[PDB]
Paper text:
We recently discovered that FEM1B, a substrate receptor of Cullin 2-RING ligase (CRL2), recognizes C-degrons containing a C-terminal proline. By solving several cryo-EM structures of CRL2FEM1B bound to different C-degrons, we elucidate the dimeric assembly of the complex. Furthermore, we reveal distinct dimerization states of unmodified and neddylated CRL2FEM1B to uncover the NEDD8-mediated activation mechanism of CRL2FEM1B. Our research also indicates that, FEM1B utilizes a bipartite mechanism to recognize both the C-terminal proline and an upstream aromatic residue within the substrate.
Conversely, the installed NEDD8 proteins induce a distinct symmetric dimerization state of N8CRL2FEM1B, named dimerS2. To obtain a higher-resolution structure to unveil the dimerS2 assembly, we collected another cryo-EM dataset for the N8CRL2FEM1B complex bound to the CDK5R1 C-degron and solved the dimerS2 structure of N8CRL2FEM1B-CDK5R1 at an overall resolution of 3.54 Å. Given that the overall architectures of both dimerS2 structures are exactly the same, we used the higher resolution dimerS2 structure of N8CRL2FEM1B-CDK5R1 for structural analysis. The dimerS2 is symmetric and mediated by two NEDD8 molecules, which display weaker density than the other complex subunits, allowing us to build only their main chains. In addition, the two RBX1 molecules, RBX1.p1 and RBX1.p2, interact with each other via symmetric hydrophobic interactions, with Trp35 and Ile37 from one RBX1 contacting Ile44, Trp87, and Val93 of  the other. The conjugation of NEDD8 disrupts the dimera assembly by introducing potential steric clashes, causing structural rearrangement to form a different dimeric assembly, dimerS2. Intriguingly, sequence alignment with the last 23 amino acids of CDK5R1 demonstrated that CDK5R1 also contains the upstream aromatic residue Phe (Phe-22). The binding data indicate that the longer fragment of the CDK5R1 C-degron (23 aa) binds to FEM1B > 5-fold more strongly than the 10-aa fragment (KDs: 1.4 vs. 7.6 μM). In contrast, both C-degrons bind to the FEM1B Ψ pocket mutant (5A) with KDs in the range of 7.8–8.8 μM. This finding suggests that Phe-22 could increase the binding affinity of CDK5R1 for FEM1B by contacting the Ψ pocket.
Residue numbers in the entry:
A (entry chain N): 1 to 76
B (entry chain E): 246 to 655, 663 to 745
C (entry chain C): 330 to 495
D (entry chain F): 21 to 105
E (entry chain J): 22 to 105
Write the structure that this text describes.
Amino acid sequence: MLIKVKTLTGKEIEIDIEPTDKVERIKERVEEKEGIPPQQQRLIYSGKQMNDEKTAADYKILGGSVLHLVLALRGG
Amino acid sequence: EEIRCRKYLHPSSYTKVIHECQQRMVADHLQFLHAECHNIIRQEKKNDMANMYVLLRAVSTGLPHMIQELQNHIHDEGLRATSNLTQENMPTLFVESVLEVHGKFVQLINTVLNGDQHFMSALDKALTSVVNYREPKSVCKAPELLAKYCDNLLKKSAKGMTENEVEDRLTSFITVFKYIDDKDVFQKFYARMLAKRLIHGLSMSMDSEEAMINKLKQACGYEFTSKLHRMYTDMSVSADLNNKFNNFIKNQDTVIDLGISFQIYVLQAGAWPLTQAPSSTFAIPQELEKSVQMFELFYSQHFSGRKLTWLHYLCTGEVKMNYLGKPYVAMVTTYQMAVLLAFNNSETVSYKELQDSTQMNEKELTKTIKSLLDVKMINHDSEKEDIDAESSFSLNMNFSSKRTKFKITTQEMEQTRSAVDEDRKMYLQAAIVRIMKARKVLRHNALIQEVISQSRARFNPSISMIKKCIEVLIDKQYIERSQASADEYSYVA
Amino acid sequence: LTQENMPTLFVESVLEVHGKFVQLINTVLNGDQHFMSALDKALTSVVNYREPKSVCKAPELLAKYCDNLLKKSAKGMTENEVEDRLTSFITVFKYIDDKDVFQKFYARMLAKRLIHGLSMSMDSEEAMINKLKQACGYEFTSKLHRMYTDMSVSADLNNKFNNFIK
Amino acid sequence: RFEVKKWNAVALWAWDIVVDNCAICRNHIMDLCIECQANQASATSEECTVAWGVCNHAFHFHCISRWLKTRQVCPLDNREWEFQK
Amino acid sequence: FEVKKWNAVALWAWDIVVDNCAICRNHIMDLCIECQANQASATSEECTVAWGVCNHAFHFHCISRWLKTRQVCPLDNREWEFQK
Ligand SMILES: [Zn+2]
Ligand SMILES: [Zn+2]
Ligand SMILES: [Zn+2]
Ligand SMILES: [Zn+2]
Ligand SMILES: [Zn+2]
Ligand SMILES: [Zn+2]
């Protein structure tokens, strides 16, 4: 499922991850289009940040939505 | 051997000794050199490719294998430089990458390899493969990317692109454009995004459009830019046409005032890709009836024997408000104006009632009403989520806009460009600090290559902003400069 | 130019001028796009030279040269050499600026070069049509290609007719 | 009172005594098909959309459908038919 | 005399379509509609096709009557120049 996560300037990120896809690498695909490496896009799932596997069903399994991500560096 | 044969021979043997020397020292070890062709070309051994070409040119069949190897290397470099790119900056990055490959390899051929014609033909045969390279079971991408590149370079953008610089950009763009396999598809796109770029006044200059047309009038036939040119000669004349119309207003027979500026854009029929309205029968609003019926007279006398077809889905009007306080003027199409016509005398307008004033079928009526309610200038009187044949509507008086001439979806180019350029700086912060986790110490000039290599599949970064953005990392206490070496950098983490 | 062999000599002359100067452009002047653009403008004016109140000879001359190269000739020109000439010929054909008349002449002398059998080889026309289709779009060689296609079918069409007699 | 100020209207002009026609039906291209003017005029009608292809020729959809029954090429230039504008 | 082989050529066109001098909207190979009237006085010899640079075919009478009051080809707005 394609995502419409907002960014630092109202951009979009295409996760292309289904609701059963874990957010451990789902944020990497969203940040692949934007440019950020996998373990740097500390995305906020409308109230919390995904940790470890973090299957997308935890974040209400929303389709697309708008996930404002943090630009937290040095997290690699 | 050249010096020796010059010293001790008659001139008639000045070319047979060197020929028979190469046939026992190069042409006899030809397979041994052709095995090293791969390593000499793929690694770009510039000092050694010159000796390679000098040795191989003398022998008979030495060159073709090196020609094939350079063609394969250019093919693989073109694929590597055009494998994965952003979906947002796809046109400009692709065109500049192809031009970069072409310029680099033509410099390499003309310096190292004496600019041999066969090597240039190999370069062209490889760039032809890489430019119109298509994924299996998919349509080729080169025509639409180059058409969008022309659009971006000719749009009224805020990149600070001067006329001379964009002329240079188009003259360099013809280099990649000549590699398109199907230019009749590129002209299908370029004549379509020249309709939008040039019927909305969106072209940055009506001379660069002519220059770009004339750069295809000579890169292809005249018939190629025969519809491209009949558009540009429809908008230049249309400026004269409006003046002639306002002078026909001054015929001094009766009072022929309209109440509308009516800045017409009469176009040719077959030239413009604008499909004549295949549906959506329309009734002209009572305010535009005078303008339509008198321009019909003017185009009947001053240009006899023509039949206007009156496209309505690219018209645009400026209508004021109905004294609702803080009046605004709306830039909407005529589709979004007849729905505001019966809306005037009656505040409560049913879906059935406007069929007697707008006369337009529900196919696009729902679309235009949805586009209105997206910004919400009109609202459903009932609670029905969709639009049915028995709907009702009235004014959303609570709606307000920050602009009197507020935009409707069909100086913002400066703000959008800065926001787009901000993501470039934002990614550059999100690229430097990864090296600090890799080696923790990098030089002033070496960090440029690491950042660019981190953004090869992305925008091409500016060298000045690399220094500018890395200074933002200093006062953020992320990284800092050591006083011993200005090139060496240290960071707190 | 010698009026008997004006096409080939003219094309060779303009081609060698382009080659010599493009060698001079980037071996000496670092090959700026400005200087290459100057070369392009200058050679465009050179090839499009016409006496006043007289039509330009360049489209007809290049059509004649390409017809001569593609003609079934007794000079024994091999297919590789003629293909190399055609690859180098486009460097001249690019500068015509009146290519809508060149196709009128090329199609006019491809009709003679197809019915009479004067073609060097049937697979050498595809080495020229595809070098103008790729260089000027498909709509340029939409009648050149439909003239060639009627040859790749006619013999087969004859094999669909003689059997029709049997 | 809603009042308009300016109208940036557009209009394609065509020669009055040069009429474009669907090359198969030989009727007016914006008008009905020959089968839509004889059989399905009363029954259904209002479905004779002008077909467009890579050939860039204007055809009635019913006419081009009847043409594509046994032969594929466009009936003005013998090109391949893709009906994709 | 007798013939062993003759190599005939033959242009082929669909009968559903026809090349038309669109000013008169009549057949290119047939007579123009203005010489269809008062045909007794007209010898029909001068009714030749007047091909222009546009690769367009028209009746000579129709295209000349067009050029008498207009200046462009009636299928595309290009300046008319006679070719053959
Ligand atoms: Zn039809
Ligand atoms: Zn029909
Ligand atoms: Zn056709
Ligand atoms: Zn006629
Ligand atoms: Zn006549
Ligand atoms: Zn014409």
